Design a protein around this ligand. Structure first.
Ligand SMILES: [Cl-]
Ligand SMILES: [Cl-]
Ligand SMILES: [Cl-]
Ligand SMILES: [Cl-]
Ligand SMILES: [Cl-]
Lengths: 445, 454, 457, 457
């Protein structure tokens, strides 16, 4: 683990919205044990920064305790300067035998110049660098950024921070799959006919409309978050407990996926989106996407995978729903076939859990049976980054594969379908699954 | 193909009628399910009014809620005929009261030495053509006695007219367990030796021999629950799917199970007797009759070869529960990694009685804790068994009545233990039984705490 | 308990002349006849005249003739003349048959006479400890088979009834079970998770040489499909028996048929070879099929969704009966080269002649890929028609019922084929020596092409 | 991208004289050499003298000699004399080799010199577009392999390092993959649900013919098990690669080794053939093993619980390398006859020589049951030592890394074997021409007996 936290961009928006609060909460849980150096261009004093931190934490609605804050302030120092100027880094070198985590909450155009400067001042040897999203908007841009970082950093020093990944129950979903033989036996194409992934948020674009309008749902949730979720569900078991062992298995999944077919991709935009501040009146940007893909390997060949994600849907829920085949044969006999086949349902967020849907006879009635059980993201990622736990941080090979996968939809986007806020999305998403299993009502907490 | 339209009960003044039958008839009447006359037959020289009085007291004695209007409907259906079952005159009289237009169900609540004489007499008086005959347990106490009894009945009845009534079977969720296994692919995929490592069958009763000590002492736990009830349960759990929907299609599959089973090894059978058993009225002071049995068996076919099947059944155990517990193999491999192997493997648990259901036991991670997860559901109905059997018999539904070929295979299976019984081990009432039953499963899965109703 | 006396009704008829006399002669040569044989027919001839008939019949077949062997056979043979509908014949028979006898009655007579003979054997109290073997045909559809059967079962138990079908004598019943049930490399593959499709081919490279009138009333479906080929399918598809006896085996076969739906006539192609109508006894406008191709299925846990195609016919290019099982391709990896051969693996069972198994796989040698044929033999060659026939006669005499279809299977197979009998599709002509009508190719159009059968070397 | 220049350090040494010159000559005869070759050594000789030496070496091997072929080879060859620890050599080499060259540096040199040479190539800026092939050995244990490797990786990427092990040149890497991954009949069987046990046998029917002093410091475990045989096992056992490249293949092999526990020294039997101590260079009291038999396992989803027995040794009865996979018996039905052959089905892979596959099954013929051998060939014969060598050289030149173990696998295999190196079990003597020490029989007591290997016809 690191023993020093250095934050570039400590006076920016993300620091104000999330980072200061997250540091405060880690301090409250007594999980901060090391100094923190804030870096920015603002010509202010440490006391002014502390005032800014205090206000930012109180503004979030977090319960404020002065003793906790005073411990945090005691760890904090501030260094002002220009991130393109070697003098800043000479000064930084005086403040730093350390094992620093450099956390860059700065514009992406500055990631490379900062890292290149840290290198010139010999400040990377025992370091890691965490970069805030975005880290690319397509395959070529991600490759260019990545080439500049890798010129001075090993892959294992690079932590690509995506807040959605902080919601993933990575260890728990592995244990569910790999420690339970009743489930592991079912977890392939011989039992599973079809998979549906649903990511629904019951709110619109609340802020940063100008930023969202240049990103869109595909880049925002599909490329990294949802594909990573699919990989966790679909991957072969890792041969070890480390992060690279896990990332080896995820990359294998993506390598067996063909690139998306734009004709099997449906793009939606909620009515009212064009009136959000920062969004262009003629925007073609999607707030919803539904698509069909597949994993063409021994475990999953021929199993269609349908994915839908979108803003302003009826609920907040992320689900992976796996449909089993019916028991084969015996169409000529009664009482061998329920109206719907068995299903394994994984709620990823919120309140993660698993539901096994079966059918049962009671008297001369047959009915569905639900076998249910159970099994912050920002602070989790920050703590993990500091401790060098890379499980929640996508590795370069996966990034490049997932960009390859989504690129055709970015290059030839299909026409926008409008949908009402609070609906399940455009009707054209129903047509996607026409000869298959209908989109089901998601399992809610 | 047709239900019966007349119920004729031999032994209507006997103990089973008093303990169970009258109450069961009353409850069917309350549910408005009796639609036909009932003729009671016994040797007692009494009037119909006296019989009604007996019926009334018998029902009230059980603790059943008594409603006079319901009882009056039942009385309205009942007539009484007195005579001796070894006298030809009784059957001539019966022949005047029952026409060739009837479809009688003859229910014989009588000693088994009388089943053949009664049936042979019904035949001589031409009273069997549209009939079925339901015989109260016991119907044999070993392979030879069952074969002899059976040969005498089959001389005048087809197999499908013979209904062997065993109250324990009335508790079995036959349809529901089939649906569970054959209509749910998530379970069908697990239901073989590639996923299942071991099976434990537990039948516990939390009471001793409350009555009929002299009868039990001649029977014992093996004959009482294992030969018919528990082996029939096992067959339901283990059989291949029937290729038809009828009772005979079902019974063809059960029989195939038993034909792949070797006879029991008396050395792998542990026999117990609870302390205090010898003081039960009617029990001999030096009895070596077992009130508990634990055994090891197997089904040596493609589905189950190499899966050990352990069974235990007994009186005066800690709870009332009948379960089939199926242990899965662990997910194979990765012994060198933490958190791939829970302390116990997944299990499929079928509570047969009471309050039938299924529990799937899995393991889950929450934080840095790992714990058991219980995925529970109820199926079928809480069992009532006597009335269910009586109704089924009357309607000709033969699912809950063991067929002759199965009866003979199960007697073959248990016979060696009856011929050369192993020594009795004493155990305390309220314990799980003799410690020697623990040794049976040494090197395998420990006997688990059963899944009890909430 | 085997029989200890053989009684043959129809000893002067065509089957006796073509087959039965030769088969008895061969059993005598192998020293397998140990009991007297009573021939029965209407012809008013002496025993000597019968012996002359037997002698000529044997020599006519091309069998090597040894006069000492023939004399042993003649020594066992007696003859009884009369009308099989008259009680007097049976009184006479009752003198020749002792109260301690265990007769096999073998009826090589017209089928309209089976019931009258058996009913007469009953009236004369000659059926205790007997069995009765009846020559094909034993019904021409479900209703006619049920009627015949009801008349026999009124006086016989099922296990006294042996329905003789010479084709079944070719079936390697024990050896195919061993192949399937004793080899885990095969048993692991023998279900819908590995097998995508099954093709059954029965080809004969000859037309109708004799008895044209008889064939014209029967047709390929009744001749080979109803009993022979469906029985072969059942052997290939059944669950393993729980015991070694005939009834355990027949329980498993029946289960197969009970999970099969009746045939779809729209998926059935009927053929007739050019020249068939010029065969003596065949009507000039006959619509009787000498060829059939059809689709069926077995709708159970082992085989659901696996299409089963069957073709059988006269005047095809070769003599061969084959069961060809296609495996699925290894799934996945379409995006990679060299994971998928041009055809999937196959398991091929040659049933007749010269039974064997071929496993077809693919192999890489340099930058070449090619088919690999892993061939082996099992059982024994029963191609020459005499061998099956003698095997059945011997089995019947010894009470071995494995090669004789049981009543429940008979009725299920008639149910299965009935719709094709009731609504026969239009006849397609095909050339002798061809593989049959081109419409049989269309049957498998979205599936695996009919492959060249695996022939003996 | 293939290389376009071959630079051979050690061109006047023994390996060059025994193998390399001949291999270059053969590649030239097949018209597969297209680029210049620079020979480097300390000897103060001319190019002509080198050529004369090369000519004689080639003729000595028994290779058919054609002067026109040799002349083409000579036309490609230049010679540079100097000392590999002197910076002047590398300045000279830097003149001869342009900044646009793609050199393959082949080091047929003592291993203590690999790092100094590579470090000198780096100081002279000669590695940018290069690969470096190093002759075995490249370590004698985990620590020595890690140290060597650390020095190379300081200046080379892993993909510029080619670790040359002549045994690997015999491996039918593509063909064995095709066999497994394109045939569903085999892929269905290729896991612990069908396979009970695996035996790997590597037998050579000769002793230590040369370089006794070298072998006596190495031993069978280091010589054939650590790299060759474990790599063979990994090929047999691995999950399918997600691509056709070398790194995709090596990802799968590494995964196998990561699921293998380190060897148990108590389950390892070490042998030494009688006469070994009289081989020149071998110490009179040597405890170096010329034979090993061991037990291991792969503790993953595919193979957990399947014991893997391996045996390798010198002076055994035949030259053959085999992987023999025993299937489980068909389960159940112990109470019935004819459901269980005396031995279970087996899948047998002959790796070398004359690679092929045998599927052992059982068949019924009459009242006899017997073994059936379903044999076929795959790949090509690489038995003669020159072929594997030339194959490796060509592959190295073209940048095909499939036959070259990757660093992660090297380190896992050293971890696996290390306990046996640390605590070697007592030497058992065995006679030349025998199958080895009797203590190797005791290893498989309670499991499947060591079988007679499947030999080429
Ligand atoms: Cl389905
Ligand atoms: Cl286990
Ligand atoms: Cl005739
Ligand atoms: Cl085995
Ligand atoms: Cl050996």
């Amino acid at each position: 683990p690191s023993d020093l936290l250095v934050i570039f961009g400590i006076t920016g928006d993300l620091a104000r919205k999330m980072t200061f609060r997250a540091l405060y909460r880690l301090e409250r849980r007594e999980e901060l044990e090391h100094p923190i150096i804030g870096v920015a261009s603002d010509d202010i004093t440490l006391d002014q920064l502390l005032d800014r931190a205090r206000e930012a934490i109180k503004a979030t609605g977090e319960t404020f305790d002065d003793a906790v804050f005073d411990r945090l302030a005691g760890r904090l120092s501030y260094l002002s300067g220009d991130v393109t100027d070697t003098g800043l880094y000479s000064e930084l070198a005086e403040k730093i035998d350390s094992r620093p985590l450099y956390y860059l909450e700065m514009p992406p155009s500055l990631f490379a110049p900062i890292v290149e400067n840290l290198a010139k001042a010999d400040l990377l040897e025992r370091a890691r660098v965490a970069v805030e999203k975005p880290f690319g908007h397509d395959l070529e841009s991600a490759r260019d950024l990545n080439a500049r970082l890798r010129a001075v950093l090993d892959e294992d020093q690079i932590l690509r921070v995506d807040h959605f990944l902080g919601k993933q129950p990575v260890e728990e979903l592995q244990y569910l799959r790999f420690a339970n033989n009743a489930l592991a036996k079912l977890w392939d194409r011989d039992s599973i006919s079809e998979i549906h992934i649903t990511m629904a948020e019951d709110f619109g674009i609340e802020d940063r409309g100008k930023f969202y309008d240049a990103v869109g749902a595909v880049r925002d949730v599909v490329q990294n978050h949802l594909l990573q979720v699919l990989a966790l569900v679909a991957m072969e078991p890792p041969v070890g407990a480390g992060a690279d062992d896990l990332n080896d298995k995820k990359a294998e999944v993506f390598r067996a996926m063909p690139s998306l077919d734009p004709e099997h991709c449906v793009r939606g935009q909620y009515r009212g989106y064009t009136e959000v501040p920062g969004v262009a009146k003629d925007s073609t940007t999607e707030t919803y996407v539904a698509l069909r893909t597949e994993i063409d390997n021994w475990r999953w060949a021929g199993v269609p995978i349908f994915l839908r994600a979108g803003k302003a849907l009826p609920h907040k829920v992320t689900e992976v729903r796996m449909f089993l085949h019916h028991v084969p044969g015996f169409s000529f006999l009664p009482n061998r076939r329920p109206p719907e086949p068995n299903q394994i349902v994984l709620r990823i967020d919120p309140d993660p859990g698993m539901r096994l849907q079966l059918s049962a006879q009671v008297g001369d009635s047959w009915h569905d049976v639900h076998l249910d059980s159970s099994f912050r993201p920002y602070e989790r990622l920050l703590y993990a980054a500091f401790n060098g736990d890379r499980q929640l941080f996508a590795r370069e090979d996966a990034i490049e594969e997932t960009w390859r996968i989504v690129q055709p939809v970015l290059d030839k986007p299909s026409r926008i379908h409008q949908y009402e806020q609070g609906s399940w999305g455009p009707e054209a998403a129903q047509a996607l699954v026409h000869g298959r299993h209908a989109w089901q009502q998601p399992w809610l907490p």
